[PDB]
Amino acid sequence: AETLDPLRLPLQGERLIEASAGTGKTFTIAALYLRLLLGLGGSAAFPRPLTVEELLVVTFTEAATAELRGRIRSNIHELRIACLRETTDNPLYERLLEEIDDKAQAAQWLLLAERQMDEAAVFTIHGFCQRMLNLNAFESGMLFEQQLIEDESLLRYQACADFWRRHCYPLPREIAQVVFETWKGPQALLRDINRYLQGEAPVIKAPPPDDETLASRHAQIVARIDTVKQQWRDAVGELDALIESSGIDRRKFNRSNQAKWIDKISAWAEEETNSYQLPESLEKFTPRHPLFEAIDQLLAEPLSIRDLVITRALAEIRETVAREKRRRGELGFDDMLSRLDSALRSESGEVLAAAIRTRFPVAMIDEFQDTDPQQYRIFRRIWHHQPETALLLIGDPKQAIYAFRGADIFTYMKARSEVHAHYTLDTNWRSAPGMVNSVNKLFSQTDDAFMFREIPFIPVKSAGKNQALRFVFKGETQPAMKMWLMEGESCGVGDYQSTMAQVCAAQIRDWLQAGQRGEALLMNGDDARPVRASDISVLVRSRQEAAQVRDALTLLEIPSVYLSNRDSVFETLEAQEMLWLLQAVMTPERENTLRSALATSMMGLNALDIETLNNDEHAWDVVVEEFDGYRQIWRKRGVMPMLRALMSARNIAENLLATAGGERRLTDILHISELLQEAGTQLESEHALVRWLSQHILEPDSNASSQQMRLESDKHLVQIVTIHKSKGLEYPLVWLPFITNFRVQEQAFYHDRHSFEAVLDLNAAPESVDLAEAERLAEDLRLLYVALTRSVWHCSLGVAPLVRRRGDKKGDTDVHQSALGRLLQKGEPQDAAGLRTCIEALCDDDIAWQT
Amino acid sequence: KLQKQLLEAVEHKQLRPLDVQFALTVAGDEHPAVTLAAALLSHDAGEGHVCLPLSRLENNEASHPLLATCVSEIGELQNWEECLLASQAVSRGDEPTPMILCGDRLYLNRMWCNERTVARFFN
Amino acid sequence: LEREDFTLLRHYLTDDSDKRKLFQLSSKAADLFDQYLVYRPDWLAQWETGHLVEGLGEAQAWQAPLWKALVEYTHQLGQPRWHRANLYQRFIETLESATTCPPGLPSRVFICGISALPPVYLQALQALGKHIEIHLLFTNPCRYYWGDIKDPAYLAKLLTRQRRHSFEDRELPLFRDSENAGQLFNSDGEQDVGNPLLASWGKLGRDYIYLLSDLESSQELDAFVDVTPDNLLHNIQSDILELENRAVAGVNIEEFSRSDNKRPLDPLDSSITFHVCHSPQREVEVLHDRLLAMLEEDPTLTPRDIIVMVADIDSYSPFIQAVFGSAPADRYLPYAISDRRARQSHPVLEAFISLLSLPDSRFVSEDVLALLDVPVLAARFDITEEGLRYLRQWVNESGIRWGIDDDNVRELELPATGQHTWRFGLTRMLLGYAMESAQGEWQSVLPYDESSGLIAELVGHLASLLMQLNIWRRGLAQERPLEEWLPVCRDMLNAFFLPDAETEAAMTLIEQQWQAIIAEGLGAQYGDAVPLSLLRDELAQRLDQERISQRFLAGPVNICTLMPMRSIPFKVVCLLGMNDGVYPRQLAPLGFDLMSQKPKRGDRSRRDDDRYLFLEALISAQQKLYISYIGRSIQDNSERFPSVLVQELIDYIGQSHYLPGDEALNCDESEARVKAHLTCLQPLPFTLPETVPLETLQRFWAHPVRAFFQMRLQVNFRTEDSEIPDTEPFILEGLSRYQINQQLLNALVEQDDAERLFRRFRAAGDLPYGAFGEIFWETQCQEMQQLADRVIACRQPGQSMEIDLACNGVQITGWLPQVQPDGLLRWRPSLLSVAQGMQLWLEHLVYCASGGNGESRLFLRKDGEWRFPPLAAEQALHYLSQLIEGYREGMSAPLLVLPESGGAWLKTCYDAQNDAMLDDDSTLQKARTKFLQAYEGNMMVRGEGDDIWYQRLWRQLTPETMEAIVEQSQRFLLPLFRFNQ
DNA sequence: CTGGAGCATAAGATCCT
DNA sequence: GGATCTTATGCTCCAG
């Protein structure tokens, strides 16, 4: 874990750079790109200078690629300017000019890079795979005309319907009964196995045999229950147990209930009193017969068709949708990723590796903490050896939060075990030194913070520029962390959230009033500026709880906006508003429909005006004439001109901006009219367009097309942002009330702890479920690190004695299963007093709390 | 079978696709006697006359040797009431059957129930 | 195949082959051999003998014998062996020693505008030039030679003297030292050219002028019009003409600090302008406004003289048409759209392509109905737009979602359910025309009793259409040779299309496209069969390829993409699609091409052509130039950079000039300043009558705000019904249960059989298939049977009575159906709704005011029960008189009463222990939390807040309207809670 | 016009030493 | 001093 400098970084062989939060990943990637372009560093450099055509830099996000390409082009330009001027003010470029040998050839190389720079190898993984396949079509075995198709959900649903139709219809009533009890329909099946189907099909722990069928499984279960029913109906009728003070002598009711539970072997349910054959229950109330454990061993094993049906679906529908997509000629992102993986796994994979190594003898993967095992296998099989071909992996495992999306941290674990070079960075630009010291204390309060020694948190030092950052609220200064313990010692989640939301709105309104009167200063040395509503921000995990805090903020007259808006624009009132307007202008003769469309909030009229309009025959005739002319201009010149004419004639573009809150509605109308226009570009007919609009209203699609845009940057208000969309950004003042909360996981899907594979389990293994809980706690730790590092000046989370078990005040609180509880209580069940002591143990003039 | 006959009847534009597909859906692939009888009944419903006697069906032979192509099995099928009562598309009204036959008359069940409704209303 | 040199092709093809891969490979190989023959035919000449050319990369070892076998095969067929590559050289040898004018040759020829010709063609013109007169019109932006340099013996030949037309001769300045020093480089081309614009963009032009100057039989003159350095665009043209450099670099501190050596720029120049826009819609809006701006400013300008260039025409043209049609008449300017996708009769083209996808379609009902939506098919099979609504409702309620026939179903390895198919639906339609719903099933099919009248011929016509579709989907499945494919096109078009006036253009186009394709197939003499998939996507590929370069100079503004080999001078030129990654249009080669692995002087790529087009587009401007690109995507407000070409141009502008104010500050300050300078972005009248029907009171109170809309101002928000689903319902949710649930309930109220009613639904095709419907049926049986025993034991035979009262001076008329002597017994399978007990509460008072001693009871599912005691006549009217007042109050004003959410609020506050209202804030705190939970729904249930009636009156809830809804509810919701038992 | 969730519960309520 | 036992009540994501 040597301290890293781009001046002395060895540009040879496999690497792994741990660039933490605010370490300038863009700055380092740009500097090392300049280093590879110039061939600088001497012994640590590549043996030859490289053209810009032979530099592969793949990055996760398309916007990240665009911004990175722009910044590196700017670096090329200003570096060539500094080389031609032989002087500069940037210390990096000054020492780079000290390191470069020949100014003339360096400047000519930079000119050639700048002119060839438009076609530099900077892609997303999906585009990069497609481009290599289009190059080596013969080696890849793929076609030539393929498109981008994103709606695999419909095809997955169709494949699920196909599987349910052809493997579940001729089954009898009793098998249908148990499968219907365990799940209702193909919608339920898709909702169960969608996350398993997406990505790569994982490894199933103890797969069922191929030849096992539903009828044979049902025969096994019915035999297994009728044997023990026969055994107990034979051996019924004797007593041995201890009649205790707790063990009542009227316990023969359970035996009589079992005797009446002897009914039939075609049922499925069993008695609660059947569980009283436990010798450990006898310890509260002498086995003497093997039945006392035969009942127990049959009870202790779960019996279902669930494993077999899940395995059949996951083995059939994937190849079914793959074959149907191949026949249709469509392609998916994971589909051609798997195509490249299979082509590399084939016997021509060595030829592919040779061709790719000769074309790009370098690759610089950005954001490695969110990568896929298929991607890592491709990278290993292509560039794992054969030097004169370098490979530099750059990532940051502490900010990998897309496991539900399909990421893996154990893939990074395997890569880190496979690579030798490890480095880190110190200059945390974005944060205050108080924040740096605070996060060092919080992640050093307990050894083994991440529950892994293989991902160690290295403390960092803030930049000397930002040492003057100090926070002032109402006169005196404030510590960098200031937690909040409410007026309670053990509380439920509802009143818990409501009270931190209420106090949150309290300090937010105090801070904004103080900034309005000039007392809450976000000040830097002698510089001092007030705090505004866009300066304060709050993080939250889920949208309903975001709405929960939003309700309190909008009740206390702080305007609030939710900048992780996943809602479609088709769900708001404007979509069906456009529906009645289009239906009324299609047939303007229907008085009832025309009146209904005219009486809405689209116009802005009043009930007295409508009532007077119902009687004025001449006014009715002239508005019929107006909408008839609108029908003429519709069927003559398309969709938007009638809308433009209608708004311009009605002055509603003025009226909605005059009325408060109408801007949001009006920009929704503009967006939906635009999207309606490129829908009607293909949809030449008008009734077809109406049917399409109705279909899209009845189906709330959640693609990127119908997402509502941000309202306005001119207006300033507090922003509610989710934790995932806050990745890679900054916020002056953050608020984290809800990270003390947690959620226990239950689904059986875990990763191998030594061999690093994804294990799909269908049983109730305690090792499986508690490994799942441990890695879920590691995930919550990673979100905690991300949330704490995304601050700038002052971060103030909420300390809470949260409880999930029904016992509210039992002495031992239930905070121990959250990230905050794990890093504060060291792994010990605590009380409110212990919480107070554990807080004040680390409290020294930088971390504190108030009621 | 006589599907080419029914489609050249379509192409002659003398009768209706309504009656053609009605005959197909009430005959299926069973006896050609039943098919042609249902075709004529559906046609006569196609103009809109509420009844039809059996004498018309056994005495017209519109544009084809209907009797010669309808005789198919053992015995003789001039007994049209038996030939149609053997089919499940014609019955005496005790069952939800398309064609009614009790008093030497064959027509739709809708017309039969409406006719008997107004008959017992007047009587 | 299998020559031990086609191993990778065998690997590619032998995995799977439905001739699609073969078709793609044939098209790409034909394109590559066309490029080979037109550019570098020496390789073909060597391949004819059977050898390769050294220095060439991979894949030549199979690209050569493929061409050898191709020429051998086409010689074996009896076709002519003559072509361009083996005739041009013999043409040269024949022409170089002959007479002056062999007969048939034209007197003279002309070439204008062409800036890229093959070297073989230029050699042919060079040899042809010794006979006739040929004029070459090339437009190079500079005057002096800016080309490359080959060898020292070649620069000696470069002293050819270029005359003018009449007066004297002229060439590049400083003859000796330019060729002496490093200007003409020892191996590389010229690098001291000055202008980096030319140096980076004239890649094609440099090799072109080098090839043109390399002809020994040349006669080169020039007519170079000078340019006046007055504005920015003319200064740029002068700098690109005279081949100099004006970019300041800061050689020392003095040069870096002093900034007067450039030319100052007019602060009000409107020639070259840069713009940044968020969306293309706003971009074209700004373009329209600025277009109207300089059209207003310059009277000596016409829209005919102005052009607009786009990167991708398809992504921009709807915006162009939309804004220029929505432009008002007083601000109108004409527009002409060219080079876009030739889309003439798009519905009939879509119908034809979907028809060619017949033998593999699953026959979605919505898909086939959208196919039927074509008016040509509608007129051919005499089904009218009036009949479309009938057919939509019939195929909705009969529930047709899946394929046409059981054979079609079983061909896709699926169980023949015999239901939800098109044949099933037509059978249900005709049996419903024959029968009645009360009769029941006939062949396990329920009869659909809506279609009974004269309107029944539409489904017969639809059945004829579906029979034709089944016949043709059986016909088109088999793969046959092209001789069998010859007449099926004509048969298809006449069978499924009625030739009308609008149809004839598409008729002729489809016929000639198919005829051309099968004519190519006949000319090449295919022998084997071919599946329909190759013909379909080849028709698609030859139908989408045809653009329209027709309307160019009609008089409106010109909208066209930057087509290669097209540079025409105008006054104002606008640029669109200058974003990063989209322009220049990148296109990776075919991979196995040898031109990318070995270049030459006569190279032409898409990127080079785009750069050359942009450079002569900059040349083409005379008065104004407009630059625009998307810089800030409004979604995430991320920063997006412009293209490399425009970035280089704006950097040159920044490094070449300075604002007149800040003369000598710094080069960086000057360029930042000029970059900032060039970049910009209610009481109502009502009187209560004395006659009120009881149903009017019933319809009023069930939803107060809805009743306000739907009779007073006669407004109902009757939106369209939901779209037909794509799948058979495997599960039943929503309103689908309620109709099935209620009719099952009424069977057990009379204690009649339910097995008959079960098979009736089983014939109707609404239940899930197999035992699943039966299992779901059992769950509904065991829940109604629990509910039935509660109803049956309290049920006595009653009868209806007519009610006629008079309260508040208002007569009340109506009917009270099926009341037994102990009171009212009603049942409805739902939950305890406030309006539900209220609905019987209205019926209870009218029975109790007109005598009639007896309490009223209500039974529901999940053990719910509403029960109200009876009162005397005087107390019954007293509550009713207030409720009659609630009508005329609600009639005039939209009374703020939530039915259920108001009831949920008052349930907590009202206490039956003291039989009064509470006022303690702790219980009032519970009421507010319960109100929002009653107003806004849970994760799955729909709250009363999401209602279109309530959404019109307000969008948010204020604390004063919070109490206002409560206060009006508390007046009218007191009798239900105070009398509940 | 109409229709809407399950599951783990502990306090209390009686049955029984 | 032990139970069963039926209710009120709690609580159920993230992104292309």
Curated annotation (Swiss-Prot), chain A:
Domain comment as written in the entry: The N-terminal DNA-binding domain (residues 1-929) is a ssDNA-dependent ATPase and has ATP-dependent 3'-5' helicase function; both are stimulated in the presence of RecC, suggesting this domain interacts with RecC. Holoenzyme reconstituted with this RecB N-terminal fragment has no nuclease activity. The C-terminal domain (residues 928-1180) has weak ssDNA endonuclease activity as an isolated fragment. RecD probably interacts with this domain. The C-terminal domain interacts with RecA, facilitating its loading onto ssDNA. Interaction is decreased by ATP. The holoenzyme may undergo conformational shifts upon DNA binding: the nuclease domain of RecB may swing away from the DNA exit tunnel in RecC. When Chi DNA binds to the RecC tunnel, the nuclease domain may then swing back to its original position (that seen in crystal structures), allowing it to nick the DNA 3' of the Chi site and then rotate to load RecA. At high Mg(2+) the nuclease domain may swing back more frequently, explaining differences seen in assays performed at high Mg(2+).
Give the coiled coil ranges: none
Task: Quote the record's activity regulation.
Answer: After reacting with DNA bearing a Chi site the holoenzyme is disassembled and loses exonuclease activity, DNA unwinding and Chi-directed DNA cleavage; RecB remains complexed with ssDNA, which may prevent holoenzyme reassembly. High levels of Mg(2+) (13 mM MgCl(2+)) or incubation with DNase allows holoenzyme reassembly, suggesting it is DNA bound to RecB that prevents reassembly. (Microbial infection) RecBCD is inhibited by the lambda virus gam protein (both GamL and GamS isoforms); in vitro a short preincubation prior to adding DNA results in maximal inhibition.
Q: Cite the UvrD-like helicase C-terminal domain residue spans from the record.
A: 462-728
| DNA-binding region per UniProt | 248-250, 493-494, 542-543, 743
Q: Which gene encodes it?
A: recB
Q: Does the keyword DNA damage apply?
A: yes
Curated annotation (Swiss-Prot), chain B:
By sequence similarity, the record places it as follows: Belongs to the RecD family.
What do we know about how this protein assembles, alone or with others? Answer: Heterotrimer of RecB, RecC and RecD. All subunits contribute to DNA-binding. (Microbial infection) Lambda virus GamS protein interacts with the enzyme without displacing any of the subunits.
Q: Under what name is this protein listed?
A: RecBCD enzyme subunit RecD
Any extra remark in the record? In the RecBCD complex, RecB has a slow 3'-5' helicase, an exonuclease activity and loads RecA onto ssDNA, RecD has a fast 5'-3' helicase activity while RecC stimulates the ATPase and processivity of the RecB helicase and contributes to recognition of the Chi site.
Organism placement in taxonomy: Bacteria, Pseudomonadati, Pseudomonadota, Gammaproteobacteria, Enterobacterales
Phenotype when the gene is knocked out? Loss of RecBCD enzyme exonuclease activity, no effect on recombination proficiency or resistance to DNA-damaging agents. Cells can be transformed with retron Ec48-containing plasmids.
Q: What does this protein do?
A: A helicase/nuclease that prepares dsDNA breaks (DSB) for recombinational DNA repair. Binds to DSBs and unwinds DNA via a rapid (>1 kb/second) and highly processive (>30 kb) ATP-dependent bidirectional helicase. Unwinds dsDNA until it encounters a Chi (crossover hotspot instigator, 5'-GCTGGTGG-3') sequence from the 3' direction. Cuts ssDNA a few nucleotides 3' to Chi site, by nicking one strand or switching the strand degraded (depending on the reaction conditions). The properties and activities of the enzyme are changed at Chi.
State the superkingdom.
Answer: Bacteria
Swiss-Prot record, chain C:
A Gene Ontology molecular function term for this protein is:
exodeoxyribonuclease V activity
Concerning Pfam families, the annotation shows: Exonuc_V_gamma, RecC_C
**Keyword field contains DNA damage:** yes
Knockout consequences: Decreased degradation of DNA with free ends that is unable to undergo homologous recombination, which can fortuitously lead to more efficient viral infection. Cells are deficient in DNA recombination repair and have increased sensitivity to UV light. The cultures have many inviable cells. Cells can be transformed with retron Ec48-containing plasmids.
**Where on the tree of life does the source sit, at the highest rank?**
Bacteria
Means of activity regulation? After reacting with DNA bearing a Chi site the holoenzyme is disassembled and loses exonuclease activity, DNA unwinding and Chi-directed DNA cleavage; RecB remains complexed with ssDNA, which may prevent holoenzyme reassembly. High levels of Mg(2+) (13 mM MgCl(2+)) or incubation with DNase allow holoenzyme reassembly, suggesting it is DNA bound to RecB that prevents reassembly.
UniProt keyword DNA repair, yes or no: yes
Per the record, the domain comment is: The holoenzyme may undergo conformational shifts upon DNA binding: the nuclease domain of RecB may swing away from the DNA exit tunnel in RecC. When Chi DNA binds to the RecC tunnel, the nuclease domain may then swing back to its original position (that seen in crystal structures), allowing it to nick the DNA 3' of the Chi site and then rotate to load RecA. At high Mg(2+) the nuclease domain may swing back more frequently, explaining differences seen in assays performed at high Mg(2+).
- From the Swiss-Prot or TrEMBL record, give the protein name: RecBCD enzyme subunit RecC
Q: Which organism is it from?
A: Escherichia coli (strain K12)
